[model samples]
Target chain A: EVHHQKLVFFAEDVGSNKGAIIGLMVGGVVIA
Target chain B: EVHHQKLVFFAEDVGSNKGAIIGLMVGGVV
Candidate 1:
């Protein structure tokens, strides 16, 4: 069995030329 | 404008040894 595969994230603006900002945090599974 | 993320995301097994799964969504600029 495959234990894990690659991870990916993507995003885009929805309307009216507005933008977005993304913040990520990685931690142990419990806290995650 | 600031376009997007790296298009690559990574996750790790936390203290419980559980894994995380993430999803992505992209839309038009206007």
Candidate 2:
């Protein structure tokens, strides 16, 4: 099965590792 | 259904992305 969704967000401050950290978090959630 | 797997390998030329590359491969397989 395949599905796609769009996410929009607003952040006051973003750090350099934010994207990688978020990616890893999403990957963990998906795998779990 | 469920299963577990592990992989180990050696390479003469290990590039910058080697770990990420291999991790992605193992992740893909699992």
Using TM-score, give the best candidate's number.
1
lDDT of candidate 1 over A2-29, digit per residue (tens): 3233436543323332223444443222
For all the predictions, what are the DockQ values? 0.05, 0.04
CAPRI-wise, candidate 1 is incorrect
TM-score of 2: 0.19
What TM-score, to 2 decimal places, does chain A of model 1 have?
Answer: 0.24
Q: Over the full model, what C-alpha lDDT does candidate 1 score relative to the true structure?
A: 0.37
lDDT of 2 by residue, B1-30 (tens): 666766666666554534223333233321
* TM-score: model 1 vs. ground truth: 0.23
lDDT measured at residue B25 in model 1 versus the true structure, 0 to 100:
50
- After superposition, which runs of candidate 2 have C-alpha atoms over 4 Å from their true positions? A1-4, A14-20, A24-32, B1-30
lDDT of 1 at A15: 30
State the displacement of the C-alpha of residue B7, model 1, in Å, after optimal TM-score superposition: 6.3
